[PDB]
Design an enzyme around this catalytic site. Structure first.
Site, PDB file in Angstrom:
ATOM      1  N   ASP A   1      -7.228  49.476  11.423  1.00  0.00           N
ATOM      2  CA  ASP A   1      -6.365  49.937  12.548  1.00  0.00           C
ATOM      3  C   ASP A   1      -4.966  49.338  12.341  1.00  0.00           C
ATOM      4  O   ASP A   1      -4.430  49.434  11.236  1.00  0.00           O
ATOM      5  CB  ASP A   1      -7.029  49.652  13.958  1.00  0.00           C
TER       6      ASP A   1
ATOM      7  N   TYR B   1       2.975  48.356  18.918  1.00  0.00           N
ATOM      8  CA  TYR B   1       3.267  49.800  18.999  1.00  0.00           C
ATOM      9  C   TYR B   1       4.663  50.064  19.385  1.00  0.00           C
ATOM     10  O   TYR B   1       5.072  51.216  19.410  1.00  0.00           O
ATOM     11  CB  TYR B   1       2.449  50.445  20.103  1.00  0.00           C
TER      12      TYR B   1
ATOM     13  N   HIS C   1     -14.300  54.944  15.543  1.00  0.00           N
ATOM     14  CA  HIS C   1     -13.135  54.121  15.336  1.00  0.00           C
ATOM     15  C   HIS C   1     -13.478  52.617  15.066  1.00  0.00           C
ATOM     16  O   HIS C   1     -12.747  51.973  14.329  1.00  0.00           O
ATOM     17  CB  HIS C   1     -12.116  54.201  16.521  1.00  0.00           C
TER      18      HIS C   1
HETATM   19  C1  LIG Z   1      -1.776  55.690  10.682  1.00  0.00           C
HETATM   20  C2  LIG Z   1      -0.496  55.578  11.405  1.00  0.00           C
HETATM   21  C3  LIG Z   1       0.504  56.513  11.413  1.00  0.00           C
HETATM   22  C4  LIG Z   1       1.521  55.973  12.226  1.00  0.00           C
HETATM   23  C5  LIG Z   1       2.792  56.607  12.374  1.00  0.00           C
HETATM   24  C6  LIG Z   1       3.123  57.883  11.983  1.00  0.00           C
HETATM   25  S1  LIG Z   1       4.796  58.088  12.301  1.00  0.00           S
HETATM   26  C7  LIG Z   1       4.927  56.479  12.883  1.00  0.00           C
HETATM   27  N1  LIG Z   1       6.092  55.977  13.307  1.00  0.00           N
HETATM   28  N2  LIG Z   1       3.798  55.819  12.868  1.00  0.00           N
HETATM   29  C8  LIG Z   1       1.159  54.729  12.699  1.00  0.00           C
HETATM   30  C9  LIG Z   1       1.870  53.752  13.569  1.00  0.00           C
HETATM   31  N3  LIG Z   1      -0.094  54.515  12.200  1.00  0.00           N
HETATM   32  C10 LIG Z   1      -0.799  53.248  12.440  1.00  0.00           C
HETATM   33  C11 LIG Z   1      -2.056  53.448  13.235  1.00  0.00           C
HETATM   34  C12 LIG Z   1      -2.983  52.261  13.116  1.00  0.00           C
HETATM   35  C13 LIG Z   1      -2.964  51.734  14.493  1.00  0.00           C
HETATM   36  C14 LIG Z   1      -1.586  52.127  14.932  1.00  0.00           C
HETATM   37  O1  LIG Z   1      -1.540  53.494  14.532  1.00  0.00           O
END
Ligand SMILES: Cc1cc(-c2csc(N)n2)c(C)n1C[C@H]1CCCO1
Ligand SMILES: Cc1cc(-c2csc(N)n2)c(C)n1C[C@H]1CCCO1
Ligand SMILES: [Mg+2]
Ligand SMILES: [Mg+2]
EC number: 3.3.2.10
Lengths: 546, 546
Positions: free
Chosen positions: B334, B465, B523
């Site tokens: 994750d 996040y 998950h």
């Molecule tokens: C796989 C993934 C894609 C993105 C993404 C796409 S575009 C952006 N800015 N981020 C993130 C942040 N993740 C990480 C997953 C793991 C837990 C948090 O989401």
């Protein structure tokens, strides 16, 4: 005026430099002079090498680009590269050949000790080769000695671009005239000079140090041999393991490789190994420096029997069980020394190798009570003083500074005879209120011990001496055994309590015993002669425990 | 009535038994039948072997005594021992051949799970041979599963002497009729029987388990496949490292060998790896299971930018520096998964190998703001809900039990769509006040998470996040690179957020990427399918990181 010193890595803190391998390979292979350097530098600010040094690409991605440059350079010079010619090969070899240039490091350390801010500013790469671990090691070893490490590939900028020097100044929080900068590449010095930094062009090390010394006004060359690296407590990994409901053991942990558990004596601390911990980790071991039961951040229960050798050893076994360690090398000093010999005798499957500083192995005498055996040697009279609960605690706790400052002394400084202590009425009855500070320790280091001992005082520590009868009966069980695992005994010439002669019959019980001996060394071996202890432990570890 | 179960080691919990090697060696070498067993048993209660089993002598001391017995036995039988005949050799081979008898162990475990006190009572020796580490490993692996381990050589008593059974009863705090005792040697069972213990004579394992099952009334044979070993928090080594003035990182540490750093996701804990930690240590690795920044016993500063990928990775590097680790294998899930891909890209020299569960590597799109990229996939809408500081914190902190019980669910149990969470006004707006307990977790395990999250709540966790723009700009620097160190991507069929298809282009950036795939896995991979995760990690570790 000067407050800061900046060092390059290649050709300055580490030698031979990689650029040098371009020169040498050409010579070795009879290639056109400078061909490799042309390939390396092809395209300048936009060629493969700059993209590498800026972090745009990784080392393994650059390797085939430099290969291609070498082809184009050789076609343009109308020559052929030999069969087997290998850029990966050349750089693997060059990068493992490069070692810390010890006198430059020791100058940087001295400057940091007189209050300089120090930094490494280097053009380097993201290293993803199969053998990258070698460089990761060198960078760890170097960088712990400096305030900052600035790598071109992490910041996106390269010497000689002016922006990296601005980034440098800003990281240092210094104006240019407060900075000396050393580099082996003159083009790299120029922008520092343009800003008014003192610069030194490093060809041979000694002449660079000579200029560095003139310009800082500090002696850096021909200086006495420095102590090994010590540990800052708050920079260490601290570990804690509960070995049973009332008892947790604290340790400090540094390094990877075979586990090596360090066991201090009375009245000491994990910190008593401060000079061995970085050296043994650096030599390829996983160090676990304990607070032994009774001490520091380990639990300290009041009852006497909690501190008999049997219970102590069983708990050290549990400590291995809970960490998931099938064995460790055990190295002890003083009481810790006695304990490690007992571990070797009762849990040889858990002990990879055993070593003691000062403490000899002596079998129980089944025909004589241990109290009597103790009464037979006037130099152990301080152990009888320790017997009565409360008496030694009151004297030792009364003034902690004076306690540690009186105890921790080199052999040419001593204030306490171990002589007729009961009769005199105390260990300190004839020492000053405020002892002078031993050469072995700083005021700061004494205050670390004082603060450790404010948590539980001397009850638990003293209790290690209060189980003579119980230890004797347990030891008698081991009278048919021999110690046949790898074993090292280290005697200290001037420990007047644990005298080197007291170890003289150990070969009867430990027939393959190895020895080291340290001259002009008192009782506090690890801090009295840390350099010599380090060399004797690492040599014996590499040959017997590895 | 029965409350306790006692197992021998040789021939009961471990197989083939050593006595067996006496039989086999005789057969293999065409020696007189029983010659080796006579030598082994010579002098009975006062012969070398009993002194060994009682702890009077060590294994290496006994070896030449058994040698001498073998000579005397062969002279008396008028035969000669072959050239090269070697007692050390025979026992080295026998002791490494012996393995845990898995179905007996799993029976002992089941009995302990239904409240039996369990113990190992064994006749064994102090092992000081060069190769002793192998047995030390077996004994560690076995003994952590039992209430007590009683070794003849540590207690000075041997089966069949009656005093050891009295010592056993006293250690168990049980009367004889409450105890079942299993042994492969009938002479050893007799004194237990004399006291009124249930005894089982173990020839083949299945028939012994069948009797054990009849006599206890518990199903032990043909039982479903058990979960891997989990961790009791208070039995672990807890480590703490300060990576900068406000930030300390906590981890749990088990095992020796190459360092393997486990990095959990949101909103989780080191404890989320509870099923991988003992298995990976058992497979020959040094596990470091982190509380990531924001969580558990790690520091949790309030500011958003403390949690951007750059700062997080730099701190993980410092964590390696302070532990003295030039590299580790990084394995993430994750958010921890995203972080380990970034470690591989920015610090490949520090990463021995990288693996992710669920989280794919996706390059930044330099032509699109990350907020937009997130808005393009309805299943990430929960990430927009997380943006506004305070909003998600209030919902998640309001009732911790309900939070973890709603989140941690297998794919056939789910209560929360990740769907139009902003619009609905919350993650739980349509889930119960008191959710039922997932099959994946116990009530106790949920309460461990609740207690962890009472220390800092969800601010620091949610902040991971809240750095989309900052992470995007940092990631754009790495757009020319490839990941060329060993790498494993593990997809989970039923993770409906981090879907396996989302990983489908990873080979463009990671050309030698390896894969595993887990079917019927939601998950929460590590606890959903711990057995399958363990097998895929250990197989990839052994081939790529070792
Ligand atoms: C796989 C993934 C894609 C993105 C993404 C796409 S575009 C952006 N800015 N981020 C993130 C942040 N993740 C990480 C997953 C793991 C837990 C948090 O989401
Ligand atoms: C070398 C030694 C001898 C004895 C001894 C002799 S007879 C008896 N009962 N003990 C002891 C306790 N030591 C240990 C040293 C290390 C620090 C404590 O003293
Ligand atoms: Mg240079
Ligand atoms: Mg048996």
């Amino acid at each position: 005026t000067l407050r800061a010193a900046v060092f390059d890595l290649d050709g300055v803190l580490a030698l031979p430099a990689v650029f040098g391998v371009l020169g040498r390979t050409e010579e070795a292979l009879a290639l056109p002079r400078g061909l490799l350097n042309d390939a390396f530098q092809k395209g300048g600010p936009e060629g493969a090498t700059t993209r590498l040094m800026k972090g745009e690409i990784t080392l393994s991605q650059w390797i085939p680009l430099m290969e291609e440059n070498c082809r184009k350079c050789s076609e343009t010079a109308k020559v052929c590269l030999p069969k087997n010619f290998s850029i990966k090969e050349i750089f693997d070899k060059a990068i493992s050949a490069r070692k810390i240039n010890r006198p430059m490091l020791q100058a940087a350390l001295m400057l940091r000790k007189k209050g300089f801010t120090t930094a490494i500013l280097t053009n380097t790469w993201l290293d993803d080769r199969a053998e990258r671990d070698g460089l990761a090691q060198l960078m760890c070893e170097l960088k712990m000695h400096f305030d900052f490490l600035i790598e071109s590939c992490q910041v996106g900028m390269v010497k000689p671009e002016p922006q990296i020097y601005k980034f440098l100044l800003d990281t240092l929080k210094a104006s240019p005239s407060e900075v000396v900068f050393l580099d082996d590449i003159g083009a790299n010095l120029k922008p520092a000079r343009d800003l008014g930094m003192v610069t030194i062009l490093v060809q041979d090390t000694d002449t660079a140090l000579k200029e560095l010394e003139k310009v800082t006004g500090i002696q850096l060359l021909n200086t006495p041999a420095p102590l090994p690296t010590s540990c800052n407590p708050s920079d260490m990994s601290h570990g804690y393991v509960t070995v049973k409901p009332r008892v947790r053991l604290h340790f400090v942990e540094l390094g990877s490789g075979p586990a090596v558990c360090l066991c201090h004596g009375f009245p000491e601390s994990w910190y008593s190994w401060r000079y061995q911990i970085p050296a043994l980790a650096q030599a390829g071991y996983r160090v676990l420096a304990m607070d032994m039961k009774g001490y520091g951040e380990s639990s300290a229960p009041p009852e006497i029997e909690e501190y008999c050798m049997e219970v102590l050893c069983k708990e050290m076994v549990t400590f291995l069980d809970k960490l998931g360690l099938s064995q460790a090398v055990f190295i002890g000093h003083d009481w810790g020394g006695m304990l490690v010999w007992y571990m070797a005798l009762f849990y040889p499957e858990r002990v990879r190798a055993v070593a003691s500083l000062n403490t000899p192995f002596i079998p129980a005498n089944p025909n004589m009570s241990p109290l009597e055996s103790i009464k037979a040697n006037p130099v152990f009279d301080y152990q009888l003083y320790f017997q009565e609960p409360g008496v030694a605690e009151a004297e030792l706790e009364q003034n902690l500074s004076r306690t540690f400052k009186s105890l921790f002394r080199a052999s040419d400084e001593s204030v306490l005879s171990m002589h007729k202590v009961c009769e005199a009425g105390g260990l300190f009855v004839n020492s000053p209120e405020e002892p002078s500070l031993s050469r072995m320790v700083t005021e700061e280091e004494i205050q670390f011990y004082v603060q450790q001992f404010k948590k539980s005082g001397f009850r638990g520590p003293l209790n290690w001496y209060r189980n003579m009868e119980r230890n004797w009966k347990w030891a008698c069980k081991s009278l048919g055994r021999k110690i046949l695992i790898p074993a090292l005994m280290v005697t200290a010439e001037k420990d007047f309590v644990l005298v080197p002669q007291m170890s003289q019959h150990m070969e009867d019980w430990i027939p393959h015993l190895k020895r080291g001996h340290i001259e002009d060394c008192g009782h506090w071996t690890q801090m009295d002669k840390p350099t010599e202890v380090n060399q004797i432990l690492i040599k014996w570890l590499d040959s017997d425990a590895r």
